[PDB]
Design a protein around this nucleic acid. Structure first.
Ligand SMILES: Nc1ncnc2c1ncn2[C@@H]1O[C@H](COP(=O)(O)OP(=O)(O)O)[C@@H](O)[C@H]1O
Ligand code: BEF
Ligand SMILES: [Mg+2]
Length: 426
RNA sequence: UCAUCCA
């Protein structure tokens, strides 16, 4: 007794249709694409015009001076445009956002118009407020010359304007889970029209803190929806759990199937004692801040250490500001915007800034504290070397971090990085 | 630990 709908909007372009099985295999080999699943996977595309996006989307793309789709776009576009459930795993900074947003636009464009009272057609869930806001900004860039309406549903901002967006009608909603659950409970929106569901940073969204919130939301979406999950990491602990939210899905990987970092990052690991970190940070910042572009993110383990380090650095004269979950949302957005503009070129952060954020010209990531997992390491260092850029990561590793040493060495080896002998000694 | 509704 539910309304019928379509989700397959894909026809192979003739240039893709006429690829031989050998040419398709060589395309996947050269782009390091692996596909797994029960149904035959569509061939990868290799040019944007193979996707038959609307002309206004092509104009924004051709603006960006992208010369070709990234590997995850090459395989993700035709899978998503074909209406398939999918998990897309690809390196940080490799274009996963447009891999799900552009097929969302195509999906929306083929659905019946929104009538007053209708909820969103596309829902994208993200683990942090700033990431949700960033994704909405990308969506609006590509739907600017269309009649597509978006909103960002997230905590720490006034409800009024969000409620008015939902009441007027939005085709795409980007949300963090808490505020969305709030609005769903009180009937400020509903998911009766949601047929395209994206979990960005999906392995984070399926962790112990988020999974009950995600389950509460996704339980309200029709099971014949299309579900698309994306991340740079896919640890064993979330894999069978993810299948609770997927039907007849295909998994795409780019690069190594094990945990791996973006190979455009120069990864440096300094094995030292906890007491040596502050002196070594000052030495490092003295070298970094004498360079032309010096935009740097410094990651620490706790909100308290974030505050303490920022206070100490600002007193020593460094133009540093911090972002963490105990700051007000206006202060969080203000600090991130000053970092984006370069007015505050040093950002000190908890893991609130470890995933998804795409900031122009970050040249250095410093792990002042090694993170809680090697997956977090891969996301943190991926704040640099995004798109066709390189960058550097510098990590302080203490004997207290020993239990993480083996997994860190494997990541370094997979990325062809030089291994500090003091690290291998551990 | 860190995120994630405080109206
Ligand atoms: N085909 C492409 N070629 C080059 N750069 C791209 C392409 N697609 C997207 N980008 C850029 O790459 C950067 C990282 O994209 P993002 O979607 O944030 O990465 P991910 O989600 O994979 O970590 C963004 O600035 C985006 O504009
Ligand atoms: F993996 Be991208 F950094 F969101
Ligand atoms: Mg992303």
């Amino acid at each position: 007794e539910l309304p019928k709908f379509e989700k397959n909007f894909y026809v192979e372009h003739p240039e893709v249709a006429r690829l031989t099985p050998y040419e398709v295999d060589e395309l996947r080999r050269k782009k390091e694409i692996t596909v797994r699943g029960g149904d035959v996977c569509p061939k990868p595309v290799f040019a944007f015009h193979h996707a038959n996006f609307p002309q206004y989307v092509m104009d924004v793309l051709m603006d960006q001076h992208f010369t070709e789709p990234t590997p995850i776009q090459c395989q993700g576009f035709p899978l998503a445009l074909s209406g398939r459930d999918m998990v897309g795993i690809a390196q940080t900074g490799s274009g996963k956002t447009l891999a799900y947003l552009l097929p969302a636009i195509v999906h929306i464009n083929h659905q019946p118009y929104l009538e007053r009272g209708d909820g969103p057609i596309c829902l994208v869930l993200a683990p942090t407020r700033e990431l949700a806001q960033q994704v909405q900004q990308v969506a609006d860039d590509y739907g600017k010359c269309s009649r597509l309406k978006s909103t960002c549903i997230y905590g720490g901002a006034p409800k009024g304007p969000q409620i008015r967006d939902l009441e007027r009608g939005v085709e795409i909603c980007i949300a963090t889970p808490g505020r969305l659950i709030d609005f769903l409970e009180s009937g400020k929106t509903n998911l009766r029209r949601c047929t395209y569901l994206v979990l960005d940073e999906a392995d984070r969204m399926l962790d112990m803190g988020f999974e009950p919130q995600i389950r509460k939301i996704v339980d309200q979406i029709r099971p014949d929806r299309q579900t698309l999950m994306w991340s740079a990491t896919w640890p064993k602990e979330v894999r069978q759990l993810a299948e609770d939210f997927l039907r007849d899905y295909t998994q795409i990987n780019v690069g190594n199937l094990e945990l791996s970092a973006n190979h455009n990052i120069l990864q440096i690991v300094d094995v030292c004692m906890e007491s040596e970190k502050d002196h070594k940070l000052i030495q490092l910042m003295e070298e970094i801040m004498a360079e032309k572009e010096n935009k740097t993110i410094i990651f620490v383990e706790t909100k308290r250490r974030c505050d303490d380090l920022t206070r100490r650095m600002r007193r020593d004269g460094w133009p540093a500001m911090c972002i963490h979950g105990d700051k007000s949302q206006p202060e969080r957005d203000w600090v991130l915007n000053e970092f984006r503009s370069g007015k505050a070129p040093i950002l000190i952060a908890t893991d609130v800034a470890s995933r998804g954020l795409d900031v122009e010209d970050v040249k250095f990531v410093i792990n002042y504290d090694y993170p809680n997992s090697s997956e977090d390491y891969v996301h943190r260092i991926g704040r640099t070397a995004r798109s066709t850029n390189k960058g550097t990561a510098y990590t302080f590793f203490t004997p207290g971090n020993l239990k993480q040493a083996r997994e860190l060495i494997k990541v370094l080896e997979e990325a062809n990085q030089a291994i500090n002998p003091k690290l291998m000694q551990l």
